[PDB]
Every structure is written in structure tokens, then in C-alpha cells.
Amino acid sequence: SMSLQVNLLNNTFANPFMNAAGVMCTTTEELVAMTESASGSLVSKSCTPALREGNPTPRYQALPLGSINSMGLPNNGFDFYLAYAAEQHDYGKKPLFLSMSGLSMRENVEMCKRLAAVATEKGVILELNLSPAVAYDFDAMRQCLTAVSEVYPHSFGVKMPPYFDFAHFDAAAEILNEFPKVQFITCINSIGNGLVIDAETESVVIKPKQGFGGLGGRYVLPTALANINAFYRRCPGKLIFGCGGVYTGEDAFLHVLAGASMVQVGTALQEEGPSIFERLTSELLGVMAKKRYQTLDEFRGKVRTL
Amino acid sequence: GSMSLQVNLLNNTFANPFMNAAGVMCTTTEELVAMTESASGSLVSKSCTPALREGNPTPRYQALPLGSINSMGLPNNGFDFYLAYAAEQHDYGKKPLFLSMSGLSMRENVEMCKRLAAVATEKGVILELNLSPAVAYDFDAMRQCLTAVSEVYPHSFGVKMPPYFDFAHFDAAAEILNEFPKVQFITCINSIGNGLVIDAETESVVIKPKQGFGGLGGRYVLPTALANINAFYRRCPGKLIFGCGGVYTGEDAFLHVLAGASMVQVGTALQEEGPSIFERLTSELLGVMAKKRYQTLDEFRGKVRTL
Ligand SMILES: Cc1cc2nc3c(=O)[nH]c(=O)nc-3n(C[C@H](O)[C@H](O)[C@H](O)COP(=O)(O)O)c2cc1C
Ligand SMILES: Cc1cc2nc3c(=O)[nH]c(=O)nc-3n(C[C@H](O)[C@H](O)[C@H](O)COP(=O)(O)O)c2cc1C
Ligand code: NI
């Protein structure tokens, strides 16, 4: 007998799967579809205080090894997602995360002040997007978390861009550990500012920023696993959510082995739609069956070093 | 049409833009001779320290479907060895030679450069100074290092860079590099640092040092490499860019050059296939150029179209 159940943040989740923020979670229809899916949870599109059109198109391109995008935070605005969380989400089906991505400290502070009562009343959980990106400037990062912690009377998580050396893992973890309200860390947002060139057209493939954009998919799995495990080790008091390169149950298995509690799906979900979650739960159970595991706790964070 | 892969830079002529990446098949005399005998346009010797280094415990390199992961730890025969190869053994009649230097402190690099100067003068060996927390990730330390080396090394040289991941960092690094006219080329990029490969079957990491964390190469890194190549191509118009990262085919090389590359270095692919790869890559790049109606590299270098 097996189970994908996860228990964390005073909630129970049927399985660890959820969408990545930015993917299939912008409109009412999308949020409802995520709620009706087999996913264990969902997160609403990273929001700004007011609606944002986002960058000019094309701004997303699917690729053999993943995706590249420079969406530019298109979203319906904070009021919209707050109302979804306050009055529409069926918390009886699954828990809900709200992703917040204010463009200044002030914006985050203002939104958090209003989110507080809805979190208290309904149980929505904040995922604060820190992905130059806030998390790549340690002073800006400390300031952001100080501000939010000061005005937001609840636990929350942070969505991180990837780091690429131990000095940075140490520096980031030192900061995160100074904030006990940060109860989860989502690793990772894209690998930033890659450049895809189409040999046939001799051109870039997205319009904004001269073709530079965030990489997702197969490209990022080892970087994601690195960041998941690095923070799993360095922030023992916190949960880690995995994000990056999940297409299969086996991929998800790797995230959990590295330390992941929840596993977010981006590029693969963009291409397949919310039905992917039935496939992913099935595949992960199958991997666990073949390896003789009954629960996620049996192998979470147990990757073997040499 | 008669096409040419010729490249001209730093008072040298290169038959084609291809060379090995530093770290790959360039450690021993036998390897250096084989690179020289190959169809490559050039070669670079293994990044050296002042004295020989055994490197990290094995396993420390693993080939992967989408590339490679490694934590070699700078195993090398020592500066004396590569200096001797450059001064006395290398056939400059066959192709130009780059020497990769990777001191573990600013002082080590300074002392090696003092001694390399005479050999650069006499034989024409070209320095690629490895700046890959990595020196290049510490802007003050980077400026400091380039100042100290420029002070003692009266020759043009290049720097090998780790990748950056945002415009603010592209600008900051370019600003520093633009302070040093002796830095005539920039090699982008070394490796995507500290990835972690986990083998689902064994439920373990695949290399031994650093709990399995190591540098990524191959298919994983091509868009990051192209971004860095083009970012510096744009921001350092007075310098040349050498590409490194994700080259398996002539088409990949075409992309490097489109992004701004003058020379194109081959790492993971070369590790897996050996030096015969250069015959294949030259032939493939010429084929790509023939199909796209280009005769020379200068016709499309850095000409990637934005939308
Ligand atoms: C179309 C698109 C939009 C995204 N927007 C957001 C976003 O609003 N907030 C966020 O934290 N991450 C955003 N991201 C990054 C994803 O959340 C995720 O971190 C990344 O795609 C890695 O997962 P993948 O490898 O599964 O694609 C976006 C990604 C894509 C592809
Ligand atoms: C085995 C191995 C050893 C390496 N050692 C060095 C080195 O000594 N000096 C250096 O600048 N880069 C070193 N690197 C990085 C490579 O030069 C190259 O930048 C990287 O592998 C990306 O190219 P690829 O995608 O073609 O593998 C090494 C890479 C590999 C795979
Ligand atoms: Ni930094």
C-alpha cells in the first residue's frame, strides 16, 4: 500500500504536485481547472498590485529541451487573485498558494498588509517571488524579507532564482535562516537570461530583451536539484519545494530524493495541460512501486553521496 | 563558391575557428601533440597552477545524455611543464598555441605571468587567464587581478569567464573588462557551476567530490553560452569573443559565431569523441555555410537577428 500524501504548513496534500507560478494559473478558468485537476495543490500567477499586460509577443517558445520565456509578469492584478482566494477557491478540494511579485518593496508591503486577513480567514499561503533579481542582490533580499516579515503576521515561502556556487548558497541560506516566518523555499525559478538562436532563421526566438529570457525544462533539472539539495542541507528548519525540469514521475522522484516536499511543474504543464497531473501521480507511484517505497518520507532528502 | 573557415586575430592566422576547451584532452605531452596533429585551428593547454596538482578524488567526471558533469579540481602537470611545451616543443608552424593559466591566488598568477612573458615574446604563445566564489563572480577581486597581471605581463591576453545570468552582471563585468585593453579576447563560458546530477536507479549522485555538485557542460549549457557570448560581444566591441559551451556539430558552431564568436572551443563533445572530431566539425560547418550561402565567418559573425 502506497501514498503520495504530504503534510506541511498545517495542511494535508493528496500528492506533492502543483503548477509552477507563471503556468496555467492566470485566469479564473485556469485556476478552476487546476483545482479540478489531480494536482495536490496550485499557486496563482505571480501578481502585481494592478493588472499588467506583460511584454510584447512572441515572449514564450517551446523547445526540444525545454522552453525560453520573457513573459514580463502578465497578470490580472492583486485584487483579482485575492478575491479568488477569499471568495471562490474550494479549499475543500486542495490548499491554495498565492504568488506575489511586487515590483518594489513598497508594493509587496502594501499587498501583504491586505493579504493578511484572507490568509487568517481562509488559509491561502503566500509564495513570495524573489526571482537584477531581488535574490541576486543579498542586501535587496534582506530588505525585502525584513519588510514583509515586519508587516505580514503569517508564515510564508520564497521563490528563488538559482545559485551556482557554495559561497552564494551559504550567503543566501544565512539570510533565509534569519527569518523564521520563511517556512518554505521554492527552488528554482528559471535559469535566467539564456539566449536561444534558431539556426534556420538566424534569429532569436522571443521579442523582449533582444531574445534573452528564462530557461525552463530539461535544461534546468541538474541546477534545480542542486539548489533544492543545497537549501535542504543549509536550511534544516525549513521545507523545500522543487521546481524545474519535471516531465515525469521519475523526474519528480529525483526532486524528492534531493529534498523536495512539493514538486512544481512548469514547461511540461504548459505543453500538456492539467491532465498531466493524473499521469504524474501514476508515474511517481509506479516508480515507488518498482523501488519498494510506500511513502515520500521514506526517501525525501536521502540522495546518496559518494 | 570557395568558402573559408579562416580566422585572423592577435597577429595570427587560424585555419578554422575550432579548438579544445581548456580542461579537455590537453594535460599530457601526448594529448598536446595529438591536438596539434588534429584538424583543429588551435589548442589550449590544461589550466595550470604553479606546481603539479593531483586534482579531486574519482569519480570526478561523468558523461550524460545531455552533456557532462565534473569536479576535476584542476589536475595538471604544473606551470613549468606547459611553459616548457610552449617554449621548446610546440610546432607553431602547424598552428597557434594558447596556454591556460589558473593560479589559486592573485600572487600565483602574477608570478607565472612574469615568467611567461619571455616565452610569449619569443615563441608567440597566447595567454588565456582562467577567472572561472569564482574570481569573475567578485567584481572587486576581478579588477584587482587584471590590474596586477597587466602590470607584469606586457602582452595581449584573454580571460575565460564563468556564465552570468542577468544584464546587471553583464554590464558590471563588461565595464571592468573594458578597463583593460590588454584583455583582447573573452572566452564565454567555462561551465554552468555546481549542478547536481542524481542517478534515479542508484538513488545517488554520480561524482565524488563536493557531495556530487559539479560543473555542467554539453547540451545543457548552449543557450547560456550563446547568451554570454552575445552579451559580451555587444558590450565589449573592442574585444573578440571565443565561444565555449554545447558544441557538438557544425550547426552548433554556426550559432556560436552568429552570436559573436571568433574561435569556438569544444569540451564535452571532444571528451567523448576524441580529436578526430575536428575533421567532422570543420566539414559540418562548411556544409552549413554552403547551404546558407556564406563564404566566410566574418559575413555572419555577431549578426544574429533580434525581433
Ligand atoms: C510561461 C512561464 C511563466 C512564468 N511565470 C512565473 C511567475 O509568474 N512566477 C514565478 O515564480 N515563476 C514563473 N515562471 C518560472 C516557473 O515558475 C518555473 O520556476 C520554471 O518554469 C521552471 O520549471 P520548468 O523547468 O518546470 O519549466 C514562469 C515560467 C514560465 C514558463
Ligand atoms: C573535464 C573537464 C575539465 C575542465 N577543466 C577546465 C580547465 O582546466 N580550465 C577551464 O578553463 N575550463 C575547464 N573546464 C570547462 C571547459 O573548458 C568548458 O568551458 C566547459 O566544459 C563547457 O564546454 P562544453 O559544453 O563544450 O563541455 C573543464 C571541463 C571539463 C569537462
Ligand atoms: Ni553576486
Tell me which H or E stretch contains A271: helix A267-272
- Tell which residue, A102, A114, A188, A187, has the closest CA to residue A145: A102
For residue A128, how many C-alpha atoms fall within 13 Å in the half-sphere facing its CB?
31
| Cβ-proximal residues to B258 (8 Å cutoff; 6+ apart), any chain | A197, A199, A202, B300, B301, B302, B303, B304
Bridge-partner residues for A243, per DSSP?
A264
- Tell which residue, A164, A162, A199, A211, has the closest CA to residue B230: A211
Task: Looking at the CA of residue A127, tell me the nearest atom of ligand 1.
Answer: 11
Grid coordinates in use for B259? 552570436
Q: Which ligand is nearest to the CA of B256?
A: 2
CA distance A58 to A69: 9
CA distance B59 to B70: 9
Can you give the CATH number for the domain in which B90 is found? 3.20.20.70
CA distance A153 to A183: 13
- Tell which residue, B292, B290, B263, has the closest CA to residue B278: B263
Contacts of A168 in chain B (CB under 8 A): 133, 137
CA distance B18 to B250: 10
B26 & B155 share domain: yes
Find cell 491586505 and name the residue: A114
CB A13 within 8 A of CB A41: yes
CA distance A7 to A13: 6
Bridge-partner residues for B70, per DSSP?
B61, B215
CB A61 within 8 A of CB A201: no
List, chain by chain if needed, residues with CB within 6 Å of any ligand 1 atom.
A 20-23, 45-46, 60, 67, 69, 71, 99, 129, 131, 159, 189-190, 216-217, 220, 243-246, 265-267, 270
Residue nearest to atom 18 of ligand 1 (CA): A189
B170 & B182 share domain: yes
CA distance B170 to B155: 25
CB A162 within 8 A of CB A187: yes
Grid coordinates in use for A4? 503520495
Grid coordinates in use for A202? 538566424
C-alpha B259 – ligand 1 centre gap (Å): 26
Find cell 579540481 and name the residue: B73
CA distance B34 to B49: 22
C-alpha torsion angle, residues A279, A281, A286, A289 (rounded to 10): -170
For residue A38, how many C-alpha atoms fall within 13 Å in the half-sphere facing its CB?
14
Grid coordinates in use for B292? 546558407
Angle at the Cα of A250 (from A249 to A255), degrees rounded to 5?
95
Across B40-81, where does the E strand assignment appear?
Answer: 43-48, 61-64, 67-70
List, chain by chain if needed, residues with CB within 6 Å of any ligand 2 atom.
B 21-24, 46-47, 61, 68, 70, 72, 100, 130, 132, 160, 190-191, 217-218, 221, 244-247, 266-268, 271
Q: Which ligand is nearest to the CA of B168?
A: 3
Q: Which ligand is nearest to the CA of B27?
A: 2
Comparing CB atoms, the residue among A133, A161, A204 nearest residue B307 is A204
Tell me which H or E stretch contains A198: strand A197-198
Task: Looking at the CA of residue A265, tell me the nearest atom of ligand 1.
Answer: 26
| Cβ-proximal residues to A181 (8 Å cutoff; 6+ apart), any chain | A148, A149, A152, A154, A155, A156
A293 exposure class (CB count in 10 Å sphere: 0-12, 13-18, 19+)? middle
Bridge-partner residues for B20, per DSSP?
B266
**Which residue of chain B has the CA closest to A165?**
B194
Distinct helix (H) and strand (E) counts, chain A: 9, 16
Residue nearest to atom 13 of ligand 2 (CA): B23
Bridge-partner residues for B129, per DSSP?
B101, B159
Amino acid identity, residue B140?
D
Find cell 544565512 and name the residue: A174
- Distance, in angstroms, between B154 CA and closest chain A CA? 33
Amino acid identity, residue A65?
L
Find cell 485566469 and name the residue: A27
Find cell 612574469 and name the residue: B114
Comparing CB atoms, the residue among B59, B202, B227 nearest residue A194 is B227
* CB atoms inside a 10 Å sphere around CB A3: 13
B88 & B23 share domain: yes
CA distance A233 to A257: 12
Angle at the Cα of B196 (from A132 to B128), degrees rounded to 5?
65
Angle at the Cα of A199 (from B239 to B292), degrees rounded to 5?
90
Tell me which H or E stretch contains B30: helix B29-37
CB contact under 8 A, A222 and B230: no
Ligand 2 pocket test target in B56, B157, B190, B222 with most atoms within 8 Å of CB: B190
B107 exposure class (CB count in 10 Å sphere: 0-12, 13-18, 19+)? exposed
- Distance, in angstroms, between A127 CA and closest chain B CA? 23
CA distance A247 to B102: 39
Could you tell me whether strands B43-48 and B97-101 are parallel, antiparallel, or unpaired per DSSP bridges?
parallel
Grid coordinates in use for A162? 538559482
CA distance A33 to A24: 9
Amino acid identity, residue B196?
L
- Distance, in angstroms, between A199 CA and closest chain B CA? 6
**Sheet strand arrangement including B97-101:** B18-20, B261-266, B240-244, B183-188, B157-161, B126-130, B97-101, B43-48
Helix axes B277-292, B250-259, angle to 10 degrees: 60
Amino acid identity, residue B256?
H
A107 & A227 share domain: yes
Supply the Cα-derived Rg of chain B in whole angstroms. Answer: 18
Angle at the Cα of A8 (from A116 to A95), degrees rounded to 5?
55
What technique was this entry resolved by? X-ray
CB contact under 8 A, A253 and B220: no
| Cβ-proximal residues to B154 (8 Å cutoff; 6+ apart), any chain | B117
B262 & B143 share domain: yes
| Cβ-proximal residues to B195 (8 Å cutoff; 6+ apart), any chain | A222, A223, A225, A226, B69, B213, B214, B215, B216, B220
Ligand 2 pocket test target in B191, B229, B242 with most atoms within 8 Å of CB: B191
CA distance A154 to A165: 31
CB A6 within 8 A of CB A296: yes
* CB atoms inside a 10 Å sphere around CB A14: 17
Residue A195 contacts B, CB cutoff 8 Å:
yes
What length does chain A have? 306
Q: Could you give the C-alpha distances from B284 to A129, A173, B53, B249, in angstroms and in order? A: 44, 46, 37, 7
CA distance B241 to B221: 17
Report helix, strand or coil for B161.
Answer: strand
Contacts of A169 in chain B (CB under 8 A): 194
DSSP string of B168-201?
HHHHHHHHHHTT-TTEEEEEE-S-EEEEE-EETT
Grid coordinates in use for A185? 523555499
CB A168 within 8 A of CB A141: no
Amino acid identity, residue A211?
G
CA distance B185 to B169: 18
CA distance B13 to B100: 20
Tell me which H or E stretch contains B160: strand B157-161
Distance of CA B280 to the CA centre of its chain: 20
| Cβ-proximal residues to B290 (8 Å cutoff; 6+ apart), any chain | B1, B3
Grid coordinates in use for B172? 558590471
Number of structural domains found in chain B: 2
CA distance A171 to A159: 16
A212 & A237 share domain: no
B106 & B143 share domain: yes
B43 & B102 share domain: yes
Q: Which structural domain, as residue segments, surrounds residue B207?
A: 56-73+192-217
B115 & B139 share domain: yes
CA distance B14 to B32: 17
Bridge-partner residues for A75, per DSSP?
A52
B224 & B239 share domain: yes
Angle at the Cα of B158 (from B156 to B162), degrees rounded to 5?
160
CB A50 within 8 A of CB A73: no
C-alpha torsion angle, residues A289, A294, A296, A300 (rounded to 10): -80
CB B282 within 8 A of CB B249: no
Residue A157 contacts B, CB cutoff 8 Å:
no
B241 & B121 share domain: yes
CA distance A68 to A249: 23
CB B216 within 8 A of CB B69: yes
Establish whether B195 is an annotated binding residue. Answer: no
Grid coordinates in use for A74? 502578465
CB contact residues (below 8 A), chain B span 117-146, against chain A: 133-134, 137
CA distance B149 to B113: 7
Q: For B280, list phi and psi in degrees, rounded to 5.
A: -65, -45
Tell me which H or E stretch contains B143: helix B139-152
Residue A225 contacts B, CB cutoff 8 Å:
yes
A90 & A197 share domain: no
Establish whether A276 is an annotated binding residue. Answer: no
CB contact under 8 A, A204 and B292: no
Can you give the CATH number for the domain in which A59 is found? 2.30.26.10
Residue B224 contacts A, CB cutoff 8 Å:
yes
Bridge-partner residues for A190, per DSSP?
none
